[PDB]
Amino acid sequence: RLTDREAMGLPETFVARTPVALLAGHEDLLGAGAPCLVEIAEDPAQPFARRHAAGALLGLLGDPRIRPFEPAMRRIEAARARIGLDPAALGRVLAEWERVGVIEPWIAKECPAHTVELAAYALMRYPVSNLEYRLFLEDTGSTELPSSWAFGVYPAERSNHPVWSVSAEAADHYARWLAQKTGRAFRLPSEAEWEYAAAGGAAREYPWGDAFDPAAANTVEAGPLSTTPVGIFPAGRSVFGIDDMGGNVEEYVADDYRAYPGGNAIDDDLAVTQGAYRVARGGSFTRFGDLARCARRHGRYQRDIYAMGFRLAETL
Amino acid sequence: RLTDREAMGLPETFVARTPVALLAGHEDLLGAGAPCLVEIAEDPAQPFARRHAAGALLGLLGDPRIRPFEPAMRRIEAARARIGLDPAALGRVLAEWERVGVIEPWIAKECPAHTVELAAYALMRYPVSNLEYRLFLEDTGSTELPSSWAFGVYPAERSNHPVWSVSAEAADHYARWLAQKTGRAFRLPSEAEWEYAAAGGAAREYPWGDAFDPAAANTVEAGPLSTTPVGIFPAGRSVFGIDDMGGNVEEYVADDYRAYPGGNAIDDDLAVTQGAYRVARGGSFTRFGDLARCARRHGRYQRDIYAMGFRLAETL
Ligand SMILES: [Ca+2]
Numbered sequence: 001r002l003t004d005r006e007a008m009g010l011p012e013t014f015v016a017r018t019p020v021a022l023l024a025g026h027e028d029l030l031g032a033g034a035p036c037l038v039e040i041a042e043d044p045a046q047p048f049a050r051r052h053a054a055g056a057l058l059g060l061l062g063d064p065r066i067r068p069f070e071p072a073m074r075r076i077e078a079a080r081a082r083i084g085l086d087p088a089a090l091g092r093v094l095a096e097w098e099r100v101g102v103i104e105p106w107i108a109k110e111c112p113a114h115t116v117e118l119a120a121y122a123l124m125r126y127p128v129s130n131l132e133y134r135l136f137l138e139d140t141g142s143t144e145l146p147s148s149w150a151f152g153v154y155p156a157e158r159s160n161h162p163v164w165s166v167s168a169e170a171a172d173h174y175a176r177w178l179a180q181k182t183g184r185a186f187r188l189p190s191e192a193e194w195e196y197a198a199a200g201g202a203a204r205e206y207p208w209g210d211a212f213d214p215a216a217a218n219t220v221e222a223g224p225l226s227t228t229p230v231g232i233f234p235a236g237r238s239v240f241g242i243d244d245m246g247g248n249v250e251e252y253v254a255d256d257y258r259a260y261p262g263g264n265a266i267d268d269d270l271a272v273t274q275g276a277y278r279v280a281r282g283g284s285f286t287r288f289g290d291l292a293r294c295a296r297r298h299g300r301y302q303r304d305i306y307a308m309g310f311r312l313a314e315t316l
Numbered sequence: 317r318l319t320d321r322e323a324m325g326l327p328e329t330f331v332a333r334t335p336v337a338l339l340a341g342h343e344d345l346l347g348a349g350a351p352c353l354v355e356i357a358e359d360p361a362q363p364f365a366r367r368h369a370a371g372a373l374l375g376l377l378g379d380p381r382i383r384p385f386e387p388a389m390r391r392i393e394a395a396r397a398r399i400g401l402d403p404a405a406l407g408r409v410l411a412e413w414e415r416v417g418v419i420e421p422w423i424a425k426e427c428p429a430h431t432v433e434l435a436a437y438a439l440m441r442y443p444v445s446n447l448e449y450r451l452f453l454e455d456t457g458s459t460e461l462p463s464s465w466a467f468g469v470y471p472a473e474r475s476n477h478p479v480w481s482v483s484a485e486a487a488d489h490y491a492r493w494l495a496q497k498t499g500r501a502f503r504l505p506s507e508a509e510w511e512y513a514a515a516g517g518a519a520r521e522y523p524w525g526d527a528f529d530p531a532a533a534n535t536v537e538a539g540p541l542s543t544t545p546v547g548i549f550p551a552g553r554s555v556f557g558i559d560d561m562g563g564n565v566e567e568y569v570a571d572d573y574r575a576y577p578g579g580n581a582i583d584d585d586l587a588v589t590q591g592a593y594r595v596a597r598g599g600s601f602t603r604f605g606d607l608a609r610c611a612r613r614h615g616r617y618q619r620d621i622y623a624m625g626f627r628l629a630e631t632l
């Protein structure tokens with residue numbers, strides 16, 4: 001029933017969260033050099049507008065943080081991961097997020113918290129970028145063009161933003177292409193690999209800790225209402241050094257939707273949702289912080305406001 | 317029946333007409349300074365990629381060519397303008413453009429060529445930009461948000477590109493707002509004022525001369541497949557010094573569609589088109605060079621690939 005803007009908490013009148021000119025008053029960045037721009041973009045003490053300005057200039061220059069054939073990876077040692085939500089903690093999540101429309105069944109599918117054995121793996125520090133996805137398209141001849149590319153056209157000023165929306169099978173295809181190109185075991189992360197990389201062995205509610213922080217991720221509460229250059233919300237980095245797990249774009253995993261086994265809570269929608277879509281995790285610039293919860297499971301519907309991107313894992 | 321990409325002459329596979337990073341190899345522009353960037357962006361001898369790079373950097377910095385409350389204007393003296401198409405020249409237009417789908421009735425509504433007395437007037441050198449339109453939205457509280465702004469959000473990296481698509485009445489509203497702000501007689505140009513400003517007293521077929529030139533304007537034949545910073549196709553400037561009249565975005569005029577009087581050619585669609593839409597002129601980054609003809613009359617249908625912007629005139 002809601003318009004896109006209503007769903008994003010915005011009025012019908014115009015709202016801006018960025019300057020009219022991103023580098024106005026930040027002209028010292030022109031002489032900084034790319035290594036200095038990278039430090040500024042990833043420094044949590046720098047105001048967002050200056051990090052955004054640095055990231056935007058890197059987007060024009062060619063961002064050296066994005067190396068398509070040797071992407072920045074973080075190693076994660078084998079572990080007994082705890083995945084999902086304790087049924088006794090559902091009430092707290094609902095009180096926390098009912099204001100934005102969350103209802104009990106959406107959170108109940110995170111139950112029960114359970115153990116998953118993970119072998120050692122690596123995960124991309126950043127989500128896959130527009131520039132990376134373009135190289136994939138040009139090498140493969142794929143017709144899997146991103147929905148946000150107007151008329152299928154590459155948005156060059158946003159070279160270092162995450163790509164969206166693509167299908168889960170296009171994300172799969174990107175991973176197979178890079179695996180073949182590099183000889184490395186690239187793939188999408190499993191749902192358990194994604195959640196553990198965000199939450200750690202401490203099972204944090206968010207990548208950054210126990211309480212939502214609108215400055216730690218690009219979400220709709222206070223984000224700029226578009227994607228951002230990867231990695232310019234450093235306060236939201238996970239314990240393993242992964243950036244943008246909360247916010248920016250939702251991220252596909254390898255798993256199609258399934259109920260977690262052992263959950264005595266009746267899900268009357270399972271008769272149509274089981275195996276019906278690929279799980280997406282992490283939330284996005286258009287949605288609220290409930291989606292930046294490490295345990296939140298999403299992906300059921302295709303909508304303009306659901307920005308679907310991805311990041312790769314690697315078998316070690 | 318055609319997809320957007322089919323209508324643009326593009327395959328299903330990916331096509332790029334820009335570098336992956338607009339300023340890669342153009343890093344000398346970082347130290348140029350805005351006046352030098354402006355000279356580069358508007359120099360027809362500079363390769364398009366370097367002009368685009370300069371314009372993109374100006375878009376980040378704040379483009380000094382765009383002065384919202386004192387927009388760059390060109391004065392045009394009172395004249396007896398010749399508007400439209402001689403019926404004897406219709407066959408030549410059809411042979412020239414039938415390959416892109418143009419058929420006789422679309423061109424026949426330009427007939428007959430006729431005389432319009434114009435008093436002295438001024439016309440904006442550039443189409444109205446994203447940055448200018450944002451200032452309008454923030455001052456008025458208007459809900460007339462541009463269609464290309466995803467979820468209604470300002471695209472800050474494209475601050476100095478033309479705004480699109482807006483309704484003709486939103487263009488009217490912008491003109492009234494600026495008139496009230498500045499005390500100057502701003503308005504949209506009449507259809508005759510627009511065509512004369514493009515074609516001159518010589519009644520050139522295109523602003524730049526008699527033959528189509530894919531490098532003189534941002535059209536779909538060879539343009540970058542998005543809007544461009546205003547004024548970076550200087551080879552297409554009109555005899556009066558107006559930029560981007562061919563290409564970039566279509567431009568509304570003050571006139572609703574009417575047949576030119578005196579045209580003995582039967583238009584069976586007049587029974588539904590008369591007064592039914594606002595005329596748009598000049599063509600765009602998504603369409604072919606037939607629309608960059610000074611006499612071509614457009615605007616009948618609302619479609620994603622029809623990018624509708626505007627520029628202001630001023631009574632002198
Ligand atoms: Ca994310």
Ligand SMILES: [Ca+2]
Nearest residue numbers: 561563565598
């Ligand atoms: Ca134009």
